[PDB]
């Protein structure tokens, strides 16, 4: 492909993302545009391949999907998936916090998700509102890989993702495994129903401290099925966490969810 | 802003190809792709 087989419709994000239809199909899609000397410079080419590397080759409803990708003199351009209903953390914000039926959908197809990634040994280490997308039945769609590794025999090291959603195995200077994303979800289901995360403190030393202790404080409001699941989330070691296929079959996701699978060709 | 990309028109093909998907693994995924160790180098 080149630019020239693209009607660019406008910019979608700056970040460039553009809303783009491709010329001889009609189909419409994200074009992400990346600057060559840019990347060079920051030192970050890397890490872009590893993101490339990874997100092109997965294939799931929930999974925002890279058709594919080229480059010309100056630019890297990524063929994505458009999700017409935008930023799921705006939504959030918006809304303030999701009521249940909202949150278990979301759960399902999180779960879904993260499952299909961990069969073929990928931890996405950064789930969060804003790195999810929504489709036209505002379907969940994980949008960014950023942190992502494809971890096949060796336990892993480094700290990354999020302050509110750090498990505590990373804080502490463990190794960690695909275990993480299974805490993250928790996190995330908190803050889907709350509007916050659980461990939220004014200083990054009392959150770590809370994230430890596993000081969860559940608001009253809650129903005692969504506390059920994000209990059996937010354990403090790793083993014990409610596997992907648990969340998956929880009889509070069974009873909330509306989730719909989208049309598949053909 | 064209007008496929703004108001009713995009709604509709948005719609449609939800509903009516296209085999996007033939129509893209078999065309060939830059290699990973190129997309730094010469185009
Ligand atoms: C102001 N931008 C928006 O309302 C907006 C942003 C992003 C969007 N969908 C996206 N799909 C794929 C990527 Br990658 S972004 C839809 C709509």
């Known amino acids: 492909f080149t630019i020239d087989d693209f009607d660019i ?15 001889q199909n009609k189909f419409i899609m994200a074009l992400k545009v990346l600057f060559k000397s840019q990347l060079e410079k920051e030192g970050v080419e890397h890490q872009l391949r590893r993101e490339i ?5 997965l294939r799931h409803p929930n999974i925002l999907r890279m058709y594919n990708y080229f480059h010309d003199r100056k630019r890297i351009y990524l063929m994505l998936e458009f999700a017409p209903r935008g930023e799921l953390y705006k939504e959030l914000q918006k809304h303030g916090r999701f009521d249940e039926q909202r949150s278990a959908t979301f759960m399902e197809e999180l779960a879904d998700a ?7 040994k990928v931890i996405h280490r950064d789930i969060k509102p804003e790195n999810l997308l929504m489709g036209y039945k505002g379907e969940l769609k994980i949008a960014d890989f950023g942190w992502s590794v494809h971890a096949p025999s060796l336990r892993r090291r480094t700290m990354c993702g999020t302050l509110d959603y750090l498990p505590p195995e990373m804080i502490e200077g463990k190794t960690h495994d695909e275990k993480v994303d299974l805490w993250c979800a928790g996190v995330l289901c908190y803050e889907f129903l709350v509007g916050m995360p659980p461990f939220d403190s004014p200083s990054h030393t009392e959150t770590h401290r809370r994230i430890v202790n596993v000081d969860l404080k559940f608001p009253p409001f809650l129903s005692d099925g969504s506390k059920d699941l994000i209990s059996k989330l937010l354990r403090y070691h790793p083993p014990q966490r409610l596997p992907l296929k648990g969340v998956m079959e929880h009889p509070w996701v069974k009873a909330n969810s509306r989730r719909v699978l989208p049309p598949v060709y053909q | 802003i064209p007008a496929w990309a703004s108001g009713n028109l995009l709604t509709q093909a948005i719609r449609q190809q939800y509903y009516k998907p296209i085999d996007v693994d033939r129509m893209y995924g078999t065309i060939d792709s830059p290699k990973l160790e190129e997309l730094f180098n010469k185009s």
């Open chain 1, 53 to 57: 590397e990874i997100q092109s080759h």
């Open chain 1, 114 to 120: 993260l499952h299909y990634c961990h069969e073929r």
């Open chain 1, 9 to 23: 419709g406008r910019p979608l994000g700056k970040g460039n993302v553009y809303l783009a239809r491709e010329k």
